[PDB]
């Protein structure tokens, strides 16, 4: 009785554990995608900032 229980629990718990890790892995994948998207948009934001700095330099030269 005890041994059969031990195997039943070990199998079903192993399946639950694998599902839990897959859920964590997919969440990490979504965070990775968002991380790359943020890398590209930070690049765009830095481009906008340097353009704004150039505009400010022109304004400073104009006066």
């Amino acid at each position: 009785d005890i041994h059969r229980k031990r195997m039943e629990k070990d199998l079903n718990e192993l399946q639950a554990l694998i599902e839990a890790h897959f859920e964590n892995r997919k969440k990490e994948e979504e965070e990775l995608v968002s991380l790359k998207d943020r890398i590209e948009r930070r690049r765009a934001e830095r481009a906008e900032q340097q353009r704004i700095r150039n505009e400010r330099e022109k304004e400073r030269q104009n006066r």
């Binding site: 041994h3 031990r6 070990d10 718990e13 192993l14 554990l17 839990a20 890790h21 964590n24």
Partner: protein
């Protein structure tokens, strides 16, 4: 993370269970071996007592 911790712990438990089954088999084997030695000793004792 937490799942890794618990899964490894359950594995640890499976390994202890496997060693437990091995130890039970070895204990039963030791009992059978003691019975075999006692039976062989009685057998030789019987064979020479029969010869006498």
């Amino acid at each position: 993370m937490d799942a890794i911790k618990k899964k490894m712990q359950m594995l640890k438990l499976d390994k202890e269970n496997a060693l437990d089954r091995a130890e039970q088999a070895e204990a039963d084997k030791k009992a059978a071996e003691d019975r075999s030695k006692q039976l062989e000793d009685e057998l030789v004792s019987l064979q020479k007592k029969l010869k006498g």
